[PDB]
Write a protein that binds this DNA or RNA. Structure first.
Lengths: 100, 124, 54, 113, 47
RNA sequence: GGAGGGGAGUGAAAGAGUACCUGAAACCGUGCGCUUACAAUCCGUCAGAGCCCUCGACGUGUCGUGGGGUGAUGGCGUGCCU
């Protein structure tokens, strides 16, 4: 069985024991959070109605807060002299799914 | 105080040259050519990060269209029916279902067909 | 005419690899007992003691 | 593998001309390489043959290795210092002439028959 | 106890000198003169 | 033949040998890994098969919050300065 959970404006297909990177959540490592679900696929029957999906939630444990890959930005326009260097590292949390 | 330029210049030269490993010909050896290629590379990467989301959405839509026509329904009618039925699975996980769990995709196609109007061309 | 552009390394090396020497073929011969290698073109001369073997 | 080396430095031949001859004796036995160089119609064969013979003598003498089991394992030519000359030309211009040298390194080693 | 390393200028006392013609980051390739003309090279008298 | 080198010694060090402190880049080699002879390439970038190496976990090979090298193949892409 597995479900499609929503967190941070995105959806992820997860099963029990899955480890998934996710946008930053305000929770300490070792805590537990509950997430809404967009679809549940248990065996054969598929849960898709809004109310049944509202009656269920996916519980996961925060593993750690990590950082994304370093991104180097160097904007440039020829025959202009314009340059603009910029870096970025996205913040992420690692969730391990405990059950559905 | 007379100042020699070596250390300050070598810093950035090393940075640029290290970033240009793997390039072909002069673009990985000479600092000036490597710097030009680095300008182009970072511009390309910035543009392609924006375009990658659309590219992946196009691939997902292609796969969903294939799996939907395998169930005797077109992609556009299937999307309309899924929206009508209120299911909120995005195209990424829809393509994931189409490839990995064909039975689930068939079930979703059934609910989408149920949610569609009886005459799609009616002025409704 | 003059070269309009500097050669790339690949083209220069690909053309330069054609400037090479071939290894002459050698056959054995017995002069003053000891066997030694000699080109076949000089076999008769070696057997007549006309080629200096160091 | 046991091995011995020898180096000829500041040999007054250009490195490419030496490489043309060296490319004939790579991975070959010392005796057959010496024969090939004896019958090669190039001027660079004498220095290269001298380096190879010196390396084989080093192997036999200093390390006490059997000459019959020697193989030209590694051999290459580098560039030495190059001297600058001038060739006068037509209408008053002077051109540059380069007098190149090379260093030749040979490593022989004992391998089982 | 005030020592020689405790002496500092007043806040806002010192201002960094602006060094022109040192790359496109600050004031590059022109030092604020614009393109060519009389004023891009020497000067114009007041009178 | 010499030049030069290999042992042997001096030296704390010969990766200090009177071509000698340190010894960068361009440039020139040798060896190993991946790739390349039906293919129209501002030479990169984004996806990416395959191969190779490496760090963890469990068996014997098989995944992982992994990491590096090369990259068949697809999309996009008109060098810098003035």
């Amino acid at each position: 069985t597995y479900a499609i959970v929503k967190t941070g404006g995105k959806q992820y297909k997860v099963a029990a024991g899955d480890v998934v990177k996710v946008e930053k959540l305000d929770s300490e490592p070792g805590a537990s959070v509950s997430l809404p679900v967009a679809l549940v696929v248990d065996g054969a029957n598929v849960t898709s109605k809004a109310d049944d999906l509202a009656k269920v939630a996916v519980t996961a444990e925060v593993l750690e807060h990590t950082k994304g890959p370093k991104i180097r930005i160097h904007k440039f326009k020829n025959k202009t002299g314009y340059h603009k260097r910029q870096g970025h590292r996205q913040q992420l949390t690692v969730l391990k799914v405990t059950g559905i | 105080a007379r100042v020699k330029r070596a250390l300050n210049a070598q810093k950035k030269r090393r940075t640029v040259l290290k970033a240009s490993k793997g390039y072909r010909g002069q673009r990985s050896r000479l600092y000036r050519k490597a710097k030009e290629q680095q300008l182009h590379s970072l511009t390309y990467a910035y543009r392609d990060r924006r375009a990658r989301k659309g590219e992946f959405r196009k691939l997902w839509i292609s796969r969903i269209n294939a799996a939907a026509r395998a169930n005797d329904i077109t992609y556009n009618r299937l999307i309309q029916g899924l929206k009508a039925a209120g299911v909120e699975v995005d195209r990424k996980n829809l393509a994931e279902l189409a490839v990995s769990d064909p039975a689930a995709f068939t079930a979703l196609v059934d609910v989408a067909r149920a949610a569609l109007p009886e005459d799609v061309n009616a002025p409704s | 005419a003059v070269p309009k552009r500097r050669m790339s390394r690949a083209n220069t090396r690909s053309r330069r690899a054609q400037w090479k020497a071939e290894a002459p073929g050698l056959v054995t011969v017995s002069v003053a007992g000891q066997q030694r290698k000699v080109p076949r073109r000089l076999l008769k001369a070696a057997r007549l003691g006309l080629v200096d073997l160091d | 593998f046991p091995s011995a080396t020898a180096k000829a430095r500041y040999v007054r031949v250009s490195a490419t001309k030496a490489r043309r001859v060296i490319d004939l004796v790579r991975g070959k036995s010392v005796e057959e390489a010496l024969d090939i160089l004896r019958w090669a119609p190039q001027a660079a064969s004498e220095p290269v043959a001298k380096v190879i013979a010196s390396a084989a003598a080093n192997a036999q003498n200093n390390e006490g290795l059997d000459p019959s089991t020697l193989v030209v394992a590694t051999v290459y030519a580098d560039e030495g210092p190059t001297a600058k000359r001038i060739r006068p030309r037509a209408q008053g211009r002077a051109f540059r002439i380069r007098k190149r040298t090379s260093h030749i390194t040979v490593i022989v080693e004992s391998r089982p028959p | 106890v005030i020592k020689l390393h405790d002496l500092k200028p007043a806040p806002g006392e010192k201002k960094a000198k602006t060094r022109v013609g040192r790359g496109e980051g600050s004031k590059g390739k022109t030092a604020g003169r614009g393109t060519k003309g009389t004023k891009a090279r020497k000067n114009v008298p007041v009178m």
